[PDB]
Amino acid sequence: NRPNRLIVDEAINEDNSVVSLSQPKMDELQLFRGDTVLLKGKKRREAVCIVLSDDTCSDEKIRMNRVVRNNLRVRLGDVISIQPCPDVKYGKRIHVLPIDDTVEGITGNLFEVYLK
Amino acid sequence: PYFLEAYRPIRKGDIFLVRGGMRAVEFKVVETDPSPYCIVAPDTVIHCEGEPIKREDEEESLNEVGYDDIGGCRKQLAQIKEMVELPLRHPALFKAIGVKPPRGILLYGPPGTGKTLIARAVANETGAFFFLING
Ligand SMILES: Nc1ncnc2c1ncn2[C@@H]1O[C@H](COP(=O)(O)OP(=O)(O)OP(O)(O)=S)[C@@H](O)[C@H]1O
Ligand SMILES: [Mg+2]
């Protein structure tokens, strides 16, 4: 019915916050190589990424990392609606927390090594 | 002949080992007048009377096997030390790395070449709990 409905393909670009589309689909949706789109998934949860281009991509599919794929409650072969979001808002305060099963050997500083 | 032409600095709290007469024997310095340590002179007198006492519960024996009893296989003993000494002496420091250790080593050779000796010596000289399984 709608040309924004897509199916999940594998990841090639090894960046976390990067999704990929093909050339005629991006020319049909009129995007650019520095835009910011939004992906709707299952369990009423969404994900924001950065859309880029790819020539090896197929017609009605989207390429994304396993991080974005698990943040949407989506597996390989599901359906995702994409929409544009020009609401470019700069952040002010970011409060994050580590997870205990992945920090059980490290202690002290984490800002300078991992996040900086 | 032990203290003669030796000038050995002894101290209260030392156990020394004397070999000879087809026997190794351990003596403990119990009492000295220049406490704690003193160099043995020809002026000294040694009162070797008294009854033999037992061992303190934490004092390990020099009858048991260390690296000194093994000869002729310096390279293989160095290779086993490079494999095993770092996951034993630093357990938790190695736990936080992300490197898997070895988990099984197979010693082989002709009968009589001292394999049980090497296993027991690498056991005792690292403080690891050593369990023995006999076939
Ligand atoms: N490299 C060695 N250095 C010093 N003593 C050794 C050495 N190899 C053997 N011996 C002596 O010979 C004894 C025999 O050693 P073992 O550990 O019984 O050899 P082995 O490999 O266990 O033989 P098998 O196959 O188990 S019967 C040791 O207890 C030592 O007294
Ligand atoms: Mg044996």
Swiss-Prot record, chain B:
Phosphorylated by tyrosine kinases in response to T-cell antigen receptor activation. Phosphorylated in mitotic cells. ATP 1 binds at P111, G112, T113, G114, K115, T116, L117. Changing L4D: Severely reduced binding to DERL1. It is found in: Cytoplasm, Cytosol; Endoplasmic reticulum; Nucleus; Cytoplasm, Stress granule. Changing D43R: No effect on binding to DERL1. Belongs to the AAA ATPase family. Homohexamer. Forms a ring-shaped particle of 12.5 nm diameter, that displays 6-fold radial symmetry. Part of a ternary complex containing STX5A, NSFL1C and VCP. NSFL1C forms a homotrimer that binds to one end of a VCP homohexamer. The complex binds to membranes enriched in phosphatidylethanolamine-containing lipids and promotes Golgi membrane fusion. Binds to a heterodimer of NPLOC4 and UFD1, binding to this heterodimer inhibits Golgi-membrane fusion. Interaction with VCIP135 leads to dissociation of the complex via ATP hydrolysis by VCP. It is linked to Inclusion body myopathy with early-onset Paget disease with or without frontotemporal dementia 1: An autosomal dominant disease characterized by disabling muscle weakness clinically resembling to limb girdle muscular dystrophy, osteolytic bone lesions consistent with Paget disease, and premature frontotemporal dementia. Clinical features show incomplete penetrance. Frontotemporal dementia and/or amyotrophic lateral sclerosis 6: A neurodegenerative disorder characterized by frontotemporal dementia and/or amyotrophic lateral sclerosis in affected individuals. There is high intrafamilial variation. Frontotemporal dementia (FTD) is characterized by frontal and temporal lobe atrophy associated with neuronal loss, gliosis, and dementia. Patients exhibit progressive changes in social, behavioral, and/or language function. This is Transitional endoplasmic reticulum ATPase. It comes from Homo sapiens. The lineage of its organism: Eukaryota, Metazoa, Chordata, Craniata, Vertebrata. The gene is VCP.
